[PDB]
Every structure is written in structure tokens, then in C-alpha cells.
Symmetry: D2
Subunit: 89 residues, 4 copies
């Protein structure tokens, strides 16, 4: 993967992040680890490794936000079903 391809990948993943933060009732702190890295698309002189790390944090964070959203919606129904079966013992 070339450096210009990685910069373009990082630019688009930041477009995904902004898209996500624009949604209804989303976790606005989801990307806090990516922000700690302070490696951004415009930092064209930083290393291929720093940019790979930033894309890693973005992908990872998007997946963790999907997981949290599921564990807190369907996970709740599951917890409730389990509580009801218990009750029905």
C-alpha cells in the first residue's frame, strides 16, 4: 500500500467518522482513542506507520460503536428474556 493510498484511506475514514457523529443519538466519544493519537489526514509528512495506526483506531472505533449500540438495544431484550425465564422457574 503506497503512502498516497494510505493518506486517501485515512481521509475517507475521517469522512466516515464525521458522518457517524452526525447521526441521531450516537456516542460522541466513540473516537476518543483516535483523537489521542493526533495523527490526521492533513499531516502528510507523518509516517506511513502513524497513518496506518490512525486508520486502525478509526476502523476499530467504528466497530466498537456498532457493538455498543447492539449490546444496548438487542442486548437489553435478551437480558429481559432471560430475566423472564428465570421468573418462570
Amino acid at each position: 500500500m503506497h503512502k498516497d493510498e494510505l493518506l486517501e484511506l485515512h481521509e475517507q475514514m475521517v469522512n466516515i467518522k464525521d458522518q457517524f457523529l452526525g447521526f441521531d443519538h450516537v456516542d460522541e466519544t466513540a473516537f476518543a482513542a483516535y483523537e489521542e493519537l493526533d495523527v490526521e489526514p492533513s499531516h502528510v509528512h507523518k509516517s506511513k506507520s502513524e497513518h496506518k495506526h490512525a486508520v486502525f483506531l478509526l476502523g476499530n472505533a467504528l466497530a466498537a460503536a456498532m457493538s455498543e449500540d447492539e449490546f444496548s438495544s438487542a442486548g437489553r431484550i435478551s437480558k429481559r428474556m432471560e430475566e423472564l425465564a428465570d421468573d418462570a422457574s
Copy 2:
């Protein structure tokens, strides 16, 4: 997060996937778990949960590909440095 927002997120993550597969020397099997799910952006009638799952697999896979790419480039230099220090004992 509304269903139309999640479909739009899934559509864009598929744009990221296609972007990545277009790069130089990339792992073309990186998204094999997302393809097993067979949940796609055009499947507008499938559940919010199936779409969240598909975005999870895409984010996760992009991050795993960054990890593999790093473990196989910088990881190699690190392994080699460690081998040389050993040698220098």
C-alpha cells in the same frame, strides 16, 4: 441511530472496502468475514441489527488489515533487530 443513517453508513463503508481493494499489494481476502454475512447496502429490507453487524465486520476488518500490514513491515525490522541483539550476546 436511524435505519436510513445506518444504511448510508454501510454504503460508505463499502466504498472504503472497494477503495482498499484497489490499493497496491493489499490483502484481497481481508473482508472475508463480511462476505460470509451476505448483508449488503442494497438489502434495505434486512434488519437494523444485520446492518450494524455488517458495519462491525467492515470496521473490524479494515483495522485487522492495518494491523497485519504493520506486523509485516515494521514487525519485521523489530524481529530482525531482536535477532541481531541476540547475536550480539
Copy 3:
């Protein structure tokens, strides 16, 4: 998997956490999302879903900490 097997997996992953936190120069905050969940091995009456989620946050936190360490050794 059965609930007893999952509580046992959660107990062992907490053993992994305590082992990692006992290592030299490690990120002591690596598991902060798991602590936010407040679902622990001893909470035997909480849901299978709450426990699967806690095992998810522990596995994920360990892999994140290995990645940070690898992305940082590389500089």
C-alpha cells in the same frame, strides 16, 4: 455456550487482565471500557448477554493494547 461456561470464560479473562496489569510498563488504562460496563465475574445473576459483552470488552481491550504497543515500538 452455557452460562456456567461463559462465567468461567469471564473469570479467566479477568485473570488475563490482572496478569497484564502486572507487567512492566503497560498501559494501566487499557481496560477502561470494561470497567465502565461494571459487569464482573462474581455477578452471577446478571445476563448471559451482559457477560458475553464483558468478555468482548476484555478480548478487545487486550488486542488494542498489543496493537498500541506494536504501533509504538515502530517509532
Copy 4:
């Protein structure tokens, strides 16, 4: 962390793997990326980097398997 601590973490994560694979109706292929790496606890002469990577693939594989199971219980 030191190499001996990392080999010990890798040994325990392999204990977690074997424990999970011993559970009822689990995904027996969950750890296939770790097997592709072929870096095991007994490979004491392989690099710290090869071992961090194997712990990464085991943590990640466990969290992926918890997620699959949660995304699938939800249907």
C-alpha cells in the same frame, strides 16, 4: 513488557482458546487467523513482535466470537 511476561501472556491466552473451544456449540474456526501466524507459546526463540502479534490475534479472535454470538442471538 518483558519477553518472559509476554510468553506467559501468550501461554494463558492459549489456555483461554482451549477453554472456549471446549464450550457447547461454539465456532470452532474462530481462531483461524491465529493458526495462520504459526507463532505459539512454545516458540520461545521467536521475536517479541511475533508474540505480541499472536496475543493480538487471540484477543481479537475472542472478541470477534463474542460479537458474532451477540449479533446472532439478536435474530
